[PDB]
Amino acid sequence: ATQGVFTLPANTRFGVTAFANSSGTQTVNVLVNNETAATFSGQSTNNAVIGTQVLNSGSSGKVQVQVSVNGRPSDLVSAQVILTNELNFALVGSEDGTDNDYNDAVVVINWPLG
Ligand SMILES: *C(=O)C[C@@H]1O[C@@H](C)[C@@H](O)[C@@H](O)[C@@H]1O
Ligand SMILES: [Ca+2]
Ligand SMILES: [Ca+2]
Ligand SMILES: [Ca+2]
Numbered sequence: 568a569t570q571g572v573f574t575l576p577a578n579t580r581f582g583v584t585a586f587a588n589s590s591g592t593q594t595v596n597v598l599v600n601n602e603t604a605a606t607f608s609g610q611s612t613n614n615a616v617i618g619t620q621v622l623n624s625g626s627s628g629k630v631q632v633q634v635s636v637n638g639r640p641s642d643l644v645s646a647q648v649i650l651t652n653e654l655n656f657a658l659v660g661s662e663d664g665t666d667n668d669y670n671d672a673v674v675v676i677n678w679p680l681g
Contacts (some may be wrong), residue, residue: 587610595634
């Protein structure tokens with residue numbers, strides 16, 4: 568199944584934050600309406616924040632997260648969780664190698680803001 572694609576409400580500010588837990592440098596691409604809107608690049612094995620940014624979901628509300636390591640797309644897992652019908656988390660994990668901890672790049676999208 569497709570992973571890392573989320574339908575957000577339209578024209579809504581959302582936060583996107585990425586953490587690294589891998590030997591390889593992580594490149595995190597965030598697309599709004601199929602256009603790249605933010606790129607994070609960093610390396611860490613201590614869950615360091617390699618990027619955090621506020622974006623607008625625009626008129627489509629389609630947000631897609633992609634992760635690339637060693638020039639190879641990482642395998643992704645994702646889901647969306649909603650608390651008390653108001654607070655939204657779109658979550659991505661990604662695996663760049665063989666150990667399947669799926670934490671190599673971890674991406675958290677949360678909304679609403681403000
Ligand atoms: C290469 O070593 C694989 C890679 O980096 C490791 C330190 C570990 O974080 C592993 O999960 C990651 O895929
Ligand atoms: Ca891994
Ligand atoms: Ca890892
Ligand atoms: Ca508030």
